Ligand binder design. Structure first.
Ligand SMILES: CCCCCCCC/C=C\CCCCCCCC(=O)OC[C@@H](O)CO
Ligand SMILES: CCCCCCCC/C=C\CCCCCCCC(=O)OC[C@H](O)CO
Ligand SMILES: CCCCCCCC/C=C\CCCCCCCC(=O)OC[C@H](O)CO
Ligand SMILES: CCCCCCCC/C=C\CCCCCCCC(=O)OC[C@H](O)CO
Ligand SMILES: CCCCCCCC/C=C\CCCCCCCC(=O)OC[C@H](O)CO
Ligand SMILES: CCCCCCCC/C=C\CCCCCCCC(=O)OC[C@H](O)CO
Ligand SMILES: CCCCCCCC/C=C\CCCCCCCC(=O)OC[C@H](O)CO
Ligand SMILES: CCCCCCCC/C=C\CCCCCCCC(=O)OC[C@H](O)CO
Ligand SMILES: CCCCCCCC/C=C\CCCCCCCC(=O)OC[C@H](O)CO
Ligand SMILES: CCCCCCCC/C=C\CCCCCCCC(=O)OC[C@H](O)CO
Ligand SMILES: CCCCCCCC/C=C\CCCCCCCC(=O)OC[C@H](O)CO
Ligand SMILES: CCCCCCCC/C=C\CCCCCCCC(=O)OC[C@H](O)CO
Length: 245
């Protein structure tokens, strides 16, 4: 063929550009037709002294200028042994990617490496995401999300900021001078003025595309069209939000 999937590196930094998370995600198309794509996604990441493996499958179908997808994931925090299943839906067009995700616990309360004296487990929740790019300047991207989790003492803004049934709204900007490279900044905000600024450095390798074209400013417009976005990584939270008791 022509396109054999995507590998993505992410490095995320806090306000002080202190590195908070590193990840590698890989999407592989197993069956690729002009209307139906079946893929696998495999991910690994390190965050707050924890390593998580994500394993998912997904389908995408194309109709009348739109792409509709479904996906599911098994997420596995290997460090604290926390297990989660996820479901995801997609509705994407040229320049515009919408997504909804649900996250569900598979295991129950067990000892926590974070708090001697209390238990942890996956918090149930979901999110709504939108990624948009400017047709007049497709290197410029915007992002909005809403997240909500259920629980008494949920670590949405980290373990030193546990909250009851918290939410977060994110607003972010990002710039992709070249298909290989994206830089972004996000603001995340919740109840009681909880707040987070996050900086993202992202690399994208598109298997089968020439290296030169992935270093071309003029190739970026094309990355925002369905013929290519059909190969994008699933837009979800690959980290397991824990709650505590
Ligand atoms: C922060 C604001 C963002 C709000 C985002 C709004 C959320 C809507 C997102 C997704 C809607 C789901 C679309 C529908 C997804 C279903 C996919 C499907 O039907 O697969 C077909 C296969 O059978 C192929 O043969
Ligand atoms: C319905 C199927 C159920 C089966 C459940 C297993 C899915 C587990 C997910 C990720 C693990 C590893 C991913 C497996 C490697 C992908 C294969 C591959 O790379 O295909 C060749 C490439 O696409 C040619 O261009
Ligand atoms: C014995 C060890 C068991 C390993 C269990 C590990 C858990 C999940 C890993 C892999 C899922 C299987 C991957 C199967 C390969 C998918 C086939 C494919 O990707 O398509 C080929 C190509 O596109 C056709 O032209
Ligand atoms: C070589 C390519 C450059 C990109 C890098 C690929 C991303 C690595 C992915 C998962 C790390 C899981 C392995 C565990 C290794 C130690 C942790 C680490 O890599 O960094 C510290 C953490 O990110 C700060 O909190
Ligand atoms: C073919 C290409 C290669 C693709 C390769 C993909 C295969 C990865 C599959 C499984 C790893 C899952 C590891 C299991 C670790 C579980 C540790 C845990 O968290 O469980 C403890 C439990 O809570 C105590 O009751
Ligand atoms: C709790 C606060 C949440 C804040 C968020 C509230 C915004 C919800 C609004 C719209 C959702 C859009 C749903 C996506 C609809 C799919 C579009 C589509 O498929 O249209 C095809 C086209 O119209 C063929 O002619
Ligand atoms: C506020 C969050 C709204 C959506 C969250 C959870 C519902 C199920 C997850 C939706 C994922 C697609 C299911 C197929
Ligand atoms: C192998 C994965 C294949 C299909 C799973 C389909 C997704 C199923 C996810 C919904 C199940 C669920 O919501 O689980 C509740 C949770 O276990 C609270 O205890
Ligand atoms: C969109 C379709 C997929 C939806 C899938 C639905 C599965 C999860 C539904 C609700 C979870 C929240 C319900 C409340 C259950 C948690 C209470 C509990 O079991 O434990 C609390 C106590 O602290 C410990 O003993
Ligand atoms: C600081 C600024 C950063 C933010 C930068 C992003 C701003 C969003 C711009 C354009 C969204 C792209 C719009 C493309 C929508 C295509 C919809 C479509 O294909 O369908 C037609 C629709 O049904 C009608 O009848
Ligand atoms: C179509 C709907 C989706 C389009 C998303 C547009 C939202 C982008 C930027 C808002 C303001 C950016 C402020 C950046 C804060 C980072 C600090
Ligand atoms: C490739 C392994 C996946 C790692 C995931 C990291 C994400 C993107 C990282 C680096 C871009 C590659 C830097 C230079 C090496 C590119 C390999 C290459 O150029 O491939 C030959 C191609 O045929 C030429 O036309």
């Amino acid at each position: 063929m022509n396109r054999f999937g995507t590998a993505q590196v992410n490095l995320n930094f806090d306000k002080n550009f202190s590195l908070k998370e590193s990840s590698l995600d890989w999407l592989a198309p197993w069956y690729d037709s002009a209307s139906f794509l079946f893929f696998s996604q495999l991910g690994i990441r390190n965050k707050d002294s924890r390593n998580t493996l994500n394993l998912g499958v997904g389908i995408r179908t194309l109709e009348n200028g739109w792409l509709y997808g479904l996906n599911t994931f098994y997420d596995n925090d290997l460090t604290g042994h926390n297990h989660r299943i996820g479901l995801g839906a997609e509705a994407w067009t040229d320049y515009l990617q919408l997504a909804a995700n649900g996250y569900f616990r598979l295991n129950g309360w067990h000892s926590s490496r974070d708090f001697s004296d209390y238990k942890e487990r996956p918090a149930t929740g979901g999110d709504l995401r939108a990624n948009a790019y400017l047709p007049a300047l497709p290197q410029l991207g915007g992002k909005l999300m809403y997240e909500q989790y259920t629980g008494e003492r949920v670590a949405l803004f980290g373990k030193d900021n546990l909250q009851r049934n918290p939410y977060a709204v994110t607003a972010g900007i990002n710039y992709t001078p070249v298909p290989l490279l994206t830089v972004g900044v996000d603001q995340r905000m919740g109840k009681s003025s909880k707040h987070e600024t996050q900086w993202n450095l992202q690399m994208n390798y598109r298997f089968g595309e020439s290296f030169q074209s992935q270093l071309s400013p003029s190739a970026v417009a094309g990355t925002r069209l369905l013929a290519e976005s059909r190969y994008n990584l699933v837009d979800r939270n690959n980290n397991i939000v824990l709650e505590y008791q």
